[PDB]
Design a protein around this ligand. Structure first.
Ligand SMILES: O=c1[nH]c2cc(C(F)(F)F)c(N3CCOCC3)cc2n(CP(=O)(O)O)c1=O
Ligand SMILES: O=c1[nH]c2cc(C(F)(F)F)c(N3CCOCC3)cc2n(CP(=O)(O)O)c1=O
Lengths: 259, 258
């Protein structure tokens, strides 16, 4: 009764150890969610095997085929018993899977090259000298579109029609575009990923302002899992105990490069 | 067999009906959490008695006595089986009681008298001609103490050492102070209460800006309640079904006045 854990390769949640070819099983991996899985496993009392989600995806309905992909699909279709990953708690996913209480809280945020005279989304909306965009598809792009909040709809008005296109294909593209643009491009992305980059060499980016919305990552189990309650109580206790905060400090700041 | 529901009189969550002296039992009360209690009950299959928390409080641990007051205390000390109320999910409360998934999302927000040239917290930070404050003790002032976001810490720098005192003794004081100052005082309070007041006569306040943090209201049960699981699944399904949004629309906007 070894529990199959599905997860995803995304720094610093799960990463390959430098010498991973020499190692086997769970020892190939390290990261925030590697450590979290061990704590949850400990608290619930199960042995487990970490597996990387086959298709590299978090989980969406292939839009017109009704079939779930990513880690969600691995749970609904019985290929994994638990997902321990930065998986966003959403209502469409709650229709088919269960989430624990959030193990991390995050939201959309602004990344700038340090010295950029921007402090907030309002600041970006009021001005055109500094360009700004988001990933070229995903929740952050989707959030600005369907927002009705005036500051956010003005931002969508600007980004949708800007030329050259202010959207980027990957997080790495957005970040390179911030560092290369002399402080005249700003990037909208998840605060956790933003705080992670601000601790990476060459330490020239910074997160500014408060977050623009409220999301959480939760641990997911298939509906009717016998683990659901035990997992939820583990997260609650790990959160109360400060362990979640200690793991965040370890992988973001202890293992950081800019402190 | 009848479960005791503790809740609090807080408009529009639970309110006395116009003719409450004429009625008995659960029919004396009405509101968002009155209707929610009915849905939770329906979904979980229990009869229930609505009772108003004896001391009118939400729940805190007296530092000197270790004793909980309010609805939290009524759950932990066995006076109630469930709280169905706008009770904030917090880490100190989760140590002693269980919360369902949130049935409502809210945050700190800015209430303005209409016509005040303020649109955001940053705006308030850059200026002093318009004063601004919060309740004189509680989570919102507390959030400003420990903030490290630049705009929010500059605000706290200002508010702590301001004269006359920008803090107020009750929400009625803060709201009356917004209406009394023709737009030269701004009040920081929960987004839900802010949106509620903006739909009530005399329709002179409004919520401005986005929320400053992320909080949630949850249904609470004593630790080890057999209802904990049923309630959580009920809230999830009511949320999925849109009932929580419909109840918000009903008590905030359908029954609004502006
Ligand atoms: O559940 C989800 N969890 C996610 C977790 C992450 C992060 F932890 F930051 F890695 C990200 N990153 C966004 C930045 O580029 C790399 C991936 C995306 C996620 N998405 C897709 P989105 O919400 O459309 O962006 C989900 O759906
Ligand atoms: O659980 C809690 N739920 C609360 C719910 C509300 C309301 F908004 F009415 F629903 C309020 N306020 C009274 C109305 O005007 C401002 C907000 C306070 C609450 N508090 C104390 P706080 O956290 O110090 O603010 C709690 O502890």
């Amino acid at each position: 009764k070894t529990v199959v854990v599905t997860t995803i390769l995304e720094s610093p949640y799960v990463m390959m150890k430098k010498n991973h070819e020499m190692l086997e099983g769970n020892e190939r991996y390290e990261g925030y969610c590697v450590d979290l899985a061990a704590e949850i496993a400990k608290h619930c009392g199960f042995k487990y095997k970490l597996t990387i989600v086959g298709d590299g995806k978090y989980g969406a309905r292939d839009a017109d085929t009704k079939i779930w992909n990513g880690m969600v699909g691995e749970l609904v279709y019985g290929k994994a018993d638990i997902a321990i990953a930065p998986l966003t708690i959403t209502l469409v996913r709650e229709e088919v899977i269960d989430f624990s209480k959030p193990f991390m809280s995050l939201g959309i945020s602004i990344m700038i090259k340090k010295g950029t005279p921007i402090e907030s989304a309002e600041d970006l909306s009021k001005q055109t000298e500094i360009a700004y965009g988001t990933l070229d598809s995903g929740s952050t792009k989707e959030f600005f579109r369907r927002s009705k909040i005036a500051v956010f709809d003005k931002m969508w008005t600007y980004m949708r029609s800007a030329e050259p296109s202010v959207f980027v294909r990957t997080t790495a593209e957005g970040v390179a575009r911030v560092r290369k643009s002399k402080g005249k491009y700003a990037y909208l992305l998840e605060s956790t990923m933003n705080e992670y980059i601000e601790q990476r060499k060459p330490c020239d980016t910074m997160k500014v302002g408060g977050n623009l919305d409220c999301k959480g990552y939760g641990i997911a189990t298939p509906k009717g899992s016998s683990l659901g309650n035990a997992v939820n109580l583990a997260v609650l206790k790990l959160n109360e105990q400060g362990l979640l905060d200690k793991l965040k400090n370890k992988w973001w700041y202890d293992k950081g490069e800019c402190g």
